[PDB]
Design an enzyme around this catalytic site. Structure first.
Site, PDB file in Angstrom:
ATOM      1  CG  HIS B  46      -1.682  -1.330   1.519  1.00 53.26           C
ATOM      2  ND1 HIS B  46      -1.119  -2.197   2.542  1.00 53.26           N
ATOM      3  CD2 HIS B  46      -2.501  -1.994   0.925  1.00 53.26           C
ATOM      4  CE1 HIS B  46      -1.710  -3.249   2.643  1.00 53.26           C
ATOM      5  NE2 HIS B  46      -2.645  -3.155   1.438  1.00 53.26           N
ATOM      6  CG  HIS B  48       0.791   3.323   4.619  1.00 53.32           C
ATOM      7  ND1 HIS B  48      -0.033   2.918   5.838  1.00 53.32           N
ATOM      8  CD2 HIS B  48       0.900   2.308   4.136  1.00 53.32           C
ATOM      9  CE1 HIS B  48      -0.089   1.690   5.715  1.00 53.32           C
ATOM     10  NE2 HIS B  48       0.605   1.179   4.753  1.00 53.32           N
ATOM     11  CG  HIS B  63      -4.008   1.591   3.277  1.00 55.79           C
ATOM     12  ND1 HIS B  63      -5.093   0.318   3.218  1.00 55.79           N
ATOM     13  CD2 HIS B  63      -3.137   1.162   4.077  1.00 55.79           C
ATOM     14  CE1 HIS B  63      -4.586  -0.673   3.691  1.00 55.79           C
ATOM     15  NE2 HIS B  63      -3.303  -0.433   4.351  1.00 55.79           N
ATOM     16  CG  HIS B  71      -8.246  -1.720   2.747  1.00 54.02           C
ATOM     17  ND1 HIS B  71      -7.197  -1.340   2.231  1.00 54.02           N
ATOM     18  CD2 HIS B  71      -8.463  -3.244   2.619  1.00 54.02           C
ATOM     19  CE1 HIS B  71      -6.454  -2.307   1.802  1.00 54.02           C
ATOM     20  NE2 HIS B  71      -7.265  -3.271   1.833  1.00 54.02           N
ATOM     21  CG  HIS B  80      -8.125   3.067   1.345  1.00 50.36           C
ATOM     22  ND1 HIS B  80      -7.694   2.084   2.521  1.00 50.36           N
ATOM     23  CD2 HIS B  80      -8.980   3.551   2.042  1.00 50.36           C
ATOM     24  CE1 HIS B  80      -8.626   2.213   3.394  1.00 50.36           C
ATOM     25  NE2 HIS B  80      -9.463   3.031   3.322  1.00 50.36           N
ATOM     26  CG  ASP B  83      -6.778   0.173  -0.424  1.00 46.36           C
ATOM     27  OD1 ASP B  83      -6.061   0.481   0.364  1.00 46.36           O
ATOM     28  OD2 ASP B  83      -7.922   0.474  -0.458  1.00 46.36           O
ATOM     29  CG  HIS B 120       1.188  -3.989   5.303  1.00 52.66           C
ATOM     30  ND1 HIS B 120       0.986  -3.325   6.740  1.00 52.66           N
ATOM     31  CD2 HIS B 120       1.016  -2.893   4.570  1.00 52.66           C
ATOM     32  CE1 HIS B 120       0.464  -2.267   6.562  1.00 52.66           C
ATOM     33  NE2 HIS B 120       0.496  -1.964   5.167  1.00 52.66           N
ATOM     34  NE  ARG B 143       1.697   1.154   9.186  1.00 51.58           N
ATOM     35  CZ  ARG B 143       1.140   2.335   9.221  1.00 51.58           C
ATOM     36  NH1 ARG B 143       2.155   3.391   8.929  1.00 51.58           N
ATOM     37  NH2 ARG B 143      -0.054   2.480   9.134  1.00 51.58           N
TER      38      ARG B 143
HETATM   39 ZN   LIG Z   1      -6.482   0.481   2.003  1.00 54.01          ZN
END
Ligand SMILES: [Zn+2]
Ligand SMILES: O=C(NCc1ccc(Cl)cc1)c1ccccc1[SeH]
Ligand SMILES: O=C(NCc1ccc(Cl)cc1)c1ccccc1[SeH]
Ligand SMILES: [Zn+2]
Lengths: 153, 153
Positions: B46, B48, B63, B71, B80, B83, B120, B143
């Site tokens: 993702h 962020h 995100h 999401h 997002h 995403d 992640h 993360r």
């Molecule tokens: Zn997301």
């Protein structure tokens, strides 16, 4: 207000956090924070062109220079946009950075977002060293630590 | 092209380089590169919100979500902006990332330059996990590595 941040890391013990804040849209940028693990004295402090750390600080390229000028001190009319002069480390190797600059910006033509901040090995001679190197890099030596300049909360 | 790059580092062995390229200004973005040190299988991937590494990957925030949606997977209309779904690590712990996305951009209002890319711990459930967590983070867990997304040559 626009807030930006940069975490400096490198191969050696030099590390730090530097904040950038710009109250008015075309107005001055406050640059402050702390760097530790430096040798006592002056260290060159520049925004380089590329937010690229693929090959360490080297891949950041030269001082950010959108106006194609020669290297200077921050106060010079003849300077790179990324030319922020020196920071000073105390006997403990800590530099309490605090600078105000009106040439860099956090919006518009001279945006430094997504570029690299670098703290160098030696003093920046502010382009007064009388060699070719002086008018390019200020003779600041190697790149001790750097980071990509990113949008902060 | 407009070319952007991101070096992922974190607390563990996870590290990698991800390139972003966008040929047309409002057109799709090719995201490719390699991440190593991952456990075999799917890992959430993702953008962020914040290019802020002051407190490790945590300070990158949620995100990137400029349109205030829930999401999703990259293919969902409800997602997002940041995403990007999952990447897959092979038996050697290497993910050869290759993605194309039309929601992220490298130019325009919701540019990802100066934000963070994060890989992640676990699979992103693409918002189909039936808990509150799913519609925020896809349950992708911690993360493992991140970097600020910066301008490349
Ligand atoms: Zn997301
Ligand atoms: O304008 C940019 N991105 C929007 C934005 C800036 C700052 C903040 Cl705090 C939030 C959002 C941008 C992108 C790339 C290079 C230079 C700039 Se200046
Ligand atoms: O494009 C922008 N600002 C200048 C710029 C262009 C291209 C590149 Cl590679 C870097 C910096 C911009 C303005 C507003 C929001 C997001 C963005 Se991203
Ligand atoms: Zn310079």
């Amino acid at each position: 207000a626009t807030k930006v941040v940069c975490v400096l890391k490198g191969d050696g013990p030099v590390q730090g956090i530097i904040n950038f804040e710009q109250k008015e849209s075309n107005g001055p940028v406050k640059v402050w924070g702390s760097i530790k693990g430096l040798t006592e004295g002056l260290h060159g402090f520049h925004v380089h062109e590329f937010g690229d750390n693929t090959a360490g600080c080297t891949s950041a390229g030269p001082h950010f220079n959108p106006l194609s000028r020669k290297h200077g001190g921050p106060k010079d009319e003849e300077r790179h946009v990324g030319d922020l002069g020196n920071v000073t480390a105390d006997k403990d190797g800590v530099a309490d950075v605090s600078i105000e600059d009106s040439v860099i910006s956090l919006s518009g033509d001279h945006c430094i977002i997504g570029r690299t901040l670098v703290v160098h090995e030696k003093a920046d001679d502010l382009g007064k060293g009388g060699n070719e190197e002086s008018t390019k890099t200020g003779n600041a030596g190697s790149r001790l630590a750097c980071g990509v300049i990113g949008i902060a909360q």
